[PDB]
Amino acid sequence: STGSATTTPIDSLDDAYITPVQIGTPAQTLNLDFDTGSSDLWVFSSETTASEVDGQTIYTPSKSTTAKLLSGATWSISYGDGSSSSGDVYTDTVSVGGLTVTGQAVESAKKVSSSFTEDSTIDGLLGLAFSTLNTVSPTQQKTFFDNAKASLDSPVFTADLGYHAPGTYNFGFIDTTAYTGSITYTAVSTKQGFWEWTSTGYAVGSGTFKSTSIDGIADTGTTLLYLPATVVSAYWAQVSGAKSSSSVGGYVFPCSATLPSFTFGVGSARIVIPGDYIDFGPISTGSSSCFGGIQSSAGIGINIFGDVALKAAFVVFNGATTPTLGFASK
Ligand SMILES: C[C@@H](C(=O)O)N(C)C(=O)OCc1ccccc1
Numbered sequence: 606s607t608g609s610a611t612t613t614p615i616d617s618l619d620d621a622y623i624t625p626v627q628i629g630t631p632a633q634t635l636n637l638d639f640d641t642g643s644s645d646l647w648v649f650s651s652e653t654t655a656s657e658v659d660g661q662t663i664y665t666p667s668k669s670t671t672a673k674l675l676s677g678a679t680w681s682i683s684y685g686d687g688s689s690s691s692g693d694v695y696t697d698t699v700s701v702g703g704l705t706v707t708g709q710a711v712e713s714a715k716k717v718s719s720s721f722t723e724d725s726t727i728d729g730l731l732g733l734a735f736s737t738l739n740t741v742s743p744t745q746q747k748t749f750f751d752n753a754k755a756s757l758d759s760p761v762f763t764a765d766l767g768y769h770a771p772g773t774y775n776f777g778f779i780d781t782t783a784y785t786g787s788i789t790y791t792a793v794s795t796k797q798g799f800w801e802w803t804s805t806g807y808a809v810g811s812g813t814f815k816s817t818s819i820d821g822i823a824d825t826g827t828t829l830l831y832l833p834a835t836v837v838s839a840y841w842a843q844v845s846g847a848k849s850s851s852s853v854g855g856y857v858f859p860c861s862a863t864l865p866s867f868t869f870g871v872g873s874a875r876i877v878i879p880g881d882y883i884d885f886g887p888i889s890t891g892s893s894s895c896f897g898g899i900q901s902s903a904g905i906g907i908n909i910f911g912d913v914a915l916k917a918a919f920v921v922f923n924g925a926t927t928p929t930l931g932f933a934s935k
């Protein structure tokens with residue numbers, strides 16, 4: 606089997622991407638944030654505290670003929686940005702882009718933090734990291750990908766995120782029309798439960814490539830590119846008037862600037878992030894200070910190849926017995 610679903614930016618900045626997901630019988634379609642940096646599939650629901658719901662579509666298990674309470678199971682998750690959610694668990698039928706899993710754990714939120722409530726466009730998360738990170742207790746649950754894997758034509762999924770445009774998540778096949786040149790594959794460590802890999806270095810604009818190992822995660826659920834302070838300083842030093850602000854919490858720069866590209870290494874290959882991808886617009890409405898898309902990973906404890914980096918590539922998440930990542934230009 607295979608599946609193929611379109612993923613759409615939630616706003617004009619590509620702050621996140623949403624993908625429609627069918628849950629239950631008859632189908633209830635929710636727009637979920639596919640997150641390769643976490644391992645829970647959780648939704649706004651009929652159980653979510655009413656004051657914490659503001660415009661999201663909810664899953665109502667009592668209206669699904671295939672929903673079953675997973676008796677005694679609870680979940681609670683905290684993300685890198687400080688946001689959180691928790692609740693109880695149902696099993697139900699879940700379909701993505703025509704690929705169906707029966708018996709998927711659907712984590713129903715009883716509580717969500719303010720950042721979720723305030724984002725009316727995201728109805729929940731679908732985690733695509735390794736199932737070792739799933740938070741369900743006392744019986745840990747599998748991700749949608751892990752439950753689908755054995756049925757897929759090939760044990761893979763691909764992320765093809767758009768810049769200010771829709772893109773695609775495919776399951777079970779690699780669309781050879783969706784990228785240019787060849788795919789370069791690189792080793793993955795599952796020791797922390799992430800799609801963790803080592804980039805071979807970077808370049809700023811038309812500058813020389815610096816060969817250096819950068820260990821980080823491929824995380825579709827993180828907006829920006831978080832790299833070591835040395836690398837980030839070298840990037841922003843090429844933009845006149847750019848500076849790290851604490852008041853803002855990151856590098857800002859003149860909205861009048863033209864940003865340089867940023868290149869990262871995948872083995873001997875190179876992925877180029879155009880400068881425009883690094884512009885996250887005014888810090889506040891009407892400001893002439895703009896927020897940068899490359900930021901320091903200092904204090905976060907890991908480097909994160911978030912959407913800024915991933916959207917410049919066709920990315921293959923290879924869940925074979927020894928997982929790997931692949932990257933192609935597009
Ligand atoms: C041969 C290798 C390399 O860069 O040395 N290469 C081109 C390559 O794609 O390696 C992919 C891979 C990594 C880990 C386990 C299996 C496969």
Ligand code: NA
């Ligand atoms: Na922000």
